[PDB]
């Protein structure tokens, strides 16, 4: 329920956007925050968010995951390891991604207890 980042707002597309407008919405922003173009700590952070937004917005397959989940009440996500993230480095993205795909990225480390 880390409602601090609307993935659609980050790219500049509506909720029921077509994948056509989503992909070019990544491309436009990528060039602005690319380190060779713009080597600022103010850029690197947005460069995460646009790739984070597009990591979910790449397919309606992932868009529906964060749509049906993304609350505290939301059912437990699919078993760890069963996520595609190669060439994104999604473990470095923020809480809203780390609540959904993150438990699968880590696989549950620390050897911690849980409440129910």
Swiss-Prot record:
Protein's job: Does not influence ATP binding or hydrolysis nor ADP release. Exerts influence on the interaction of DnaK with substrates; in the presence of DafA, DnaJ inhibits substrate binding, and substrate already bound to DnaK is displaced by DnaJ and DafA.
Subcellular location(s) per record: Cytoplasm
Organism annotation: Thermus thermophilus (strain ATCC 27634 / DSM 579 / HB8)
Span of the entire protein shown here: 1 to 116 of 280
Quaternary structure note: Forms a heterononamer with DnaJ and DafA in the resting state. Three copies of each protein are present in the complex.
Domain called J: residue spans: 6-70
Superkingdom, taxonomy of origin: Bacteria
Name of the featured protein: Chaperone protein DnaJ 2
Similarity section: Belongs to the DnaJ family.
